[PDB]
Amino acid sequence: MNNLHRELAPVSDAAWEQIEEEASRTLKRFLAARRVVDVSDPQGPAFSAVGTGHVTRLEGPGDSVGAVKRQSQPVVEFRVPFILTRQAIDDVERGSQDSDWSPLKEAARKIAGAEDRAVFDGYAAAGIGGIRPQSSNSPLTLPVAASGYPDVIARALDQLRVAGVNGPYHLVLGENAYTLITSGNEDGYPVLQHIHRLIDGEIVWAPAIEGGVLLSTRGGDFAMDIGQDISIGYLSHTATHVELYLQESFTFRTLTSEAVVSLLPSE
């Protein structure tokens, strides 16, 4: 028994397997920051802070003794609860293949959105700066039409090159920008082929954010330290419902501020 009191839940093994498969699929579909960010192996439940290497001067203890305090970034824990109806859970053992896992999918969407917004836009309460607000390059506004995309991307690339940043360049686009770029132009311009000539991978789809980001994936610029990966735990149950939750524990740091350019949503 660990803090996820899974054995206390009135949930059969087959129902657990189906729930885990659904959660993994939905999270992999929704998680965008993990595709362009250095993700460490899970460091365990005891992992509590990451040392930044910097110090802060203190008022001295006394006679000619100087003191400095080491600085660190704390780890944050995200939890999202959801409720299953106990009819979907019991139907699995009876051979059901269309049990209602919608609350689990909504919880997965919520937690993935929270994680993505913390990594990209920042979470001030947890001490997470965010990739975009902590960029030293000048932000660029996205165009209204898709034909304007090759012009912006190129300029963004130039900034990276002028900053001395190397390595593959990856583009992350929000829902509106992604659907605008992928829906084609009515003038027959092949903007998609030109963009894929400029960028070094598939365009990443990010439902949680607005606008976009062009960033280097050489490694060592954006560190995501994982204490606990997303896992399912049990809270309580009634005669007709079961309380579960999705939980993760992580911290994020931006190490190189010149390795990312933030694209603002079009006006």
Partner: peptide
């Protein structure tokens, strides 16, 4: 135990 082992998707 209990994790989904999503890890890195890069």
């Amino acid at each position: 135990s209990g994790s989904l082992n999503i890890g890195s998707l890069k």
